[PDB]
Each structure stands twice: as C-alpha cells, then as structure tokens.
Ligand binder design. Structure first.
Ligand SMILES: CCCCCN1C(=O)C(=O)c2cc(SCCc3ccc(C(=O)O)cc3)ccc21
Ligand SMILES: [Cl-]
Length: 271
C-alpha cells in the first residue's frame, strides 16, 4: 500500500536513529541477562560486601566528586541513579532532534516537550535493563539486585521499587527496540503538556507517529491482539511513578540539604 510505506519508512527512520542515539538497547540488555555468559557476564552486587568488592570492577567512578565518597552508600547510589539520568536526557534530546518536524516546532514547545517527556521515557528505557531480580549498571558490566536496593536507608530504600514494579508489567508486553523507538517518539510529542504555545502542530505529528506505531505493532506482533491499546494504557502507570518521583525529591531536598543536583535536573525539576 502506498500510504503504509510512509509509515514503515517512518518506522525504519526512527528505529535507525534509536540505535544511533542509545548505546544500551533492549537487545543487548537481554543478551547479557540470559545465560549467554562468558564475555558479557556481569558482576552482581547483592549486599554491602559485594558492593565494596565490586568497586574494583563496577566502575563506581562516575559519582560526583563534590558529593562522592564522604556520603553514605544510600546517597551515593542515588547519585549514580541521577547520573544515569543526565545521560538519558542527553540521548533523548539527541533522539528528539531526529523526529521529523520536532525541530521545526517552536523552541519553547521543544523545551517544554523535553522537560515533561524525558522522565516518562527514562522509566520506559530503564525497564529494558531490568528483570524481576535487578537492573543492569555500568553499561551492562554490573547487575544490582532488587533485594539490595530495597534494603537501603529510607526513603532511598523504597525509591527503586516503583520502577521495578513498572518494569515487570511493561516487560510483559515483550516489545523490542523497533517498537520502543516509535513509542518513545509518541511520548515526546504529547500535546497535553503544560505551557505549550502552539498545540496543533504537535498533535499533527503525534497522529502520524501513532499511525506508525499501530502499524508497527500489528506487523511485528501479529499474534498479540490489542497490543496497541494495552501499550497506550501503560502510560497511566508511567505518570504515577513520575508523580511519586517528584514527591520524594522534595522530601530529599529538605532532608538532605547538603546534597547537590546536576543542573540539568534542577531545571527539569520545576513542578
Ligand atoms: C536507562 C535510562 C536512564 C535510567 C536512569 N535511572 C533512573 O532513573 C533510575 O532511577 C535508576 C536506577 C538505577 S540502579 C542504582 C543506581 C546506579 C546507577 C548506575 C550505577 C553504575 O555504576 O553504573 C550504579 C548504580 C540505574 C539507573 C537509573
Ligand atoms: Cl544511562
């Protein structure tokens, strides 16, 4: 069909830019997590002992020097959790520029779409690095168990749990990276974001993106019926984790007044 080819060439385009923008794809994460072993076998951190024992191999050097070794383990892990967020935002930003028409919208809308969109995308991509037992870290060289993160000092202990809760339900849909590329594009171009000056051009692109996603899911998963509707229904789960993420940030801000934030997050954190 002549009109379907525009959507599939659009899917091929977003898939191509997805691979170019994100080094940690779901396919590589799944290769490490299944028992294909030898070279890509990760080191596992399950308790405070293995953590110090793995700092030789875990590359825990990416912790901010101003607020690094002096702080307790619970704050440091939170610091590394936020350091993987600046990297995702940078990559989502580079990814957003490749979505056709995005760079042609108003600048203020572009900043608005990224300010509210990156967090919903982060937890979507974080699910690719997760199973029921833990999450990949250090570019797949490490694996931090869900049990150990859950055991951290409060409220940092119950901060990774809602992401693990979302990952197990989201990973049940069995989407690959070709589907996630289009879905991530749909999340960016939401016309219902607060402060959008011109909403109509944003909705026009998301129509085209949703058309591409529905056709992509029908061809890549022909046996899974209503995968389109069930995938769109899981953003209600994505806005909830976001809303409790903003709730523990203001708690940490007044509990840990001596803790810095990366300027990219401090600007995103304004709601
Ligand atoms: C994939 C898209 C962006 C994800 C951003 N991101 C979160 O938002 C989040 O909550 C979270 C939680 C962890 S787990 C504990 C933190 C941690 C991080 C890195 C290392 C390391 O040494 O590599 C060690 C520990 C990791 C990444 C996270
Ligand atoms: Cl990252």
């Amino acid at each position: 069909n002549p009109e379907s080819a525009d959507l599939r060439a659009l899917a091929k385009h977003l898939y191509d830019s997805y691979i170019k923008s994100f080094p940690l794809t779901k396919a590589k994460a799944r290769a490490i997590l299944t028992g294909k072993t030898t070279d890509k076998s990760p080191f596992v951190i399950y308790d405070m002992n293995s953590l110090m024992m793995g700092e030789d191999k875990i590359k825990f050097k990416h912790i901010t020097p101003l607020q690094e070794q002096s702080k307790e383990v619970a704050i440091r892990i939170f610091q590394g959790c936020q350091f993987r967020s600046v990297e995702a935002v940078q990559e989502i930003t580079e990814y957003a520029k490749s979505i056709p028409g995005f760079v042609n919208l108003d600048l203020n809308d572009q900043v608005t779409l990224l300010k509210y969109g990156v967090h919903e995308i982060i937890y979507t991509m974080l699910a690719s690095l997760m199973n029921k037992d833990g999450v990949l870290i250090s570019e797949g060289q490490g694996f931090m168990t869900r049990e150990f993160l859950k055991s951290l000092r409060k409220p940092f202990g119950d901060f990774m749990e809602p992401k693990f809760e979302f990952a197990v339900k989201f990973n049940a849909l069995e989407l690959d990276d070709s589907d996630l590329a289009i879905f991530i594009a749909v999340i960016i171009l939401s016309g219902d974001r607060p402060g959008l000056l011109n909403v109509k051009p944003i909705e026009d692109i998301q129509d085209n993106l949703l058309q591409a996603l529905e056709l992509q899911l029908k061809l890549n998963h022909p046996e899974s019926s209503q995968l389109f509707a069930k995938l769109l229904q899981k953003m209600t789960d994505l806005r909830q984790i976001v809303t409790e993420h903003v709730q523990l940030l203001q708690v940490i801000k007044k509990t840990e007044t001596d803790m810095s934030l990366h300027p990219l997050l401090q600007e995103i954190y304004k709601d």
